[PDB]
Amino acid sequence: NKINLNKPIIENKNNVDVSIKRYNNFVDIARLSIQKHFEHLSNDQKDSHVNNMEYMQKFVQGLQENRNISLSKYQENKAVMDLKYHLQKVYANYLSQEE
Numbered sequence: 001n002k003i004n005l006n007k008p009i010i011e012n013k014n015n016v017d018v019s020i021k022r023y024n025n026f027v028d029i030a031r032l033s034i035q036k037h038f039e040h041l042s043n044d045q046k047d048s049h050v051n052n053m054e055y056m057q058k059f060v061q062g063l064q065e066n067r068n069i070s071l072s073k074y075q076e077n078k079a080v081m082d083l084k085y086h087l088q089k090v091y092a093n094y095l096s097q098e099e
Ligand SMILES: CCCCCCCCCCCCCCCCCCCC(=O)O[C@H](COC(=O)CCCCCCCCCCCCCC)COP(=O)(O)OCCN
Pocket: 035, 039, 078, 079, 081, 082, 085, 089, 090, 091, 093
């Protein structure tokens, strides 16, 4: 139940959405999961990852396989955007910690 950042990114070819309830709950889980990964990163790493798109994609893709849920392409891109917003806030809190 861990994620491998060494797997390359694959095109999501599913165009059948999961329900909003499943999508939101998934995003909740993806949020905390990448938060824990990001918080364990070193200082210089969290600087290069906060806005790293490929990093969030690899996370959304891994999490889909592991949780055996298949988002649609559109849902996967929306989930990545969401993880971005979340990471920015995690990072904000970390920076003010450091202060
Ligand atoms: C496609 C685009 C989609 C984008 C969607 C946007 C949707 C908005 C996002 C949902 C809104 C929730 C946002 C909460 C703020 C997040 C920023 C804090 C994240 C964070 O790192 O806090 C960790 C704990 O989490 C926490 O529990 C702290 C959270 C702070 C909550 C802020 C208080 C607000 C009051 C709540 C009212 C409810 C509002 C009703 C909607 C602390 O880090 P750590 O504990 O892991 O460890 C390190 C400590 N040493």
